[PDB]
């Protein structure tokens with residue numbers, strides 16, 4: 112079995128190998144990359160996403176989110192308070208202000224220590240989930256707006272034609288902005304490109320051990336667990352590496368830098384934080400290997416998780432017994 116310790120693997124595809132996206136995902140899996148839940152892909156030196164980032168300041172962040180924490184430094188939840196609209200140029204100036212800017216630090220490890228010590232005492236503002244793309248239309252390789260759709264994959268594998276669409280999303284971050292522990296909707300893959308700015312640190316649990324993280328989460332967030340049998344779908348719970356190690360949960364960590372892709376694999380729980388002002392683009396995708404994970408994915412029916420239009424068909428076709436209850440949650 113390849114990669115039996117479930118380490119995060121880093122790939123350096125050649126320009127030739129960067130042509131065929133599906134083929135390269137399948138290659139990475141042949142080497143055991145999926146066992147980690149997360150892989151890094153460094154593009155060939157010939158490749159670029161677009162020519163420059165000099166002209167992005169006028170993009171609007173319609174609903175910036177202030178991420179307010181509750182709990183203790185290593186075990187906390189966050190809620191998202193809606194703020195007034197602002198442009199990317201306005202958000203960048205805010206990120207760089209004395210109140211929000213990255214503190215002085217020695218290296219990524221020192222910054223990570225500071226994050227976990229002090230995150231709860233601040234409320235950073237995240238521009239998340241903005242439909243759009245920063246890839247040039249002429250970028251032919253690994254262009255996250257030109258991927259094969261999940262609807263087409265389901266139709267190719269299973270024969271059933273379904274409604275829905277699959278587009279990318281932009282994320283504008285600042286120091287301490289946080290992504291809570293989660294898997295993707297319907298335990299899909301994700302791909303994330305860090306277009307510009309400061310790094311993003313990731314934590315990930317191997318898919319084969321995801322239920323260990325769920326059992327810990329039920330213990331640590333006992334009211335939330337009574338409220339919903341899949342409350343990690345709410346995307347609000349944080350658990351630090353120190354707490355994971357104290358509880359024997361297998362995990363790994365890695366820092367993504369500008370110009371790098373990360374892929375999350377089906378049922379790979381992940382969480383992380385941004386080091387300073389940055390911009391990422393991400394989208395969900397599927398392969399043939401996803402279908403069995405989609406059929407088994409948990410679902411939130413309590414009403415909190417509320418998701419896209421396109422999840423309806425995935426539940427309806429892959430999980431017809433759960434469909435009626437899940438849809439009640441959506442209405």
Ligand SMILES: O=C(O)CNC(=O)C(=O)O
Pocket residue numbers: 282289290301302303375391393394
């Ligand atoms: O970058 C972020 O805030 C969150 N991104 C992801 O969870 C992802 O790409 O799957």
Ligand SMILES: [Mg+2]
Pocket residue numbers: 166167168169170
């Ligand atoms: Mg602009």
Ligand code: NI
Pocket residue numbers: 293294295301375381
């Ligand atoms: Ni994700």
Ligand SMILES: [Zn+2]
Pocket residue numbers: 338339340341342344345411412413414415416
């Ligand atoms: Zn729920």
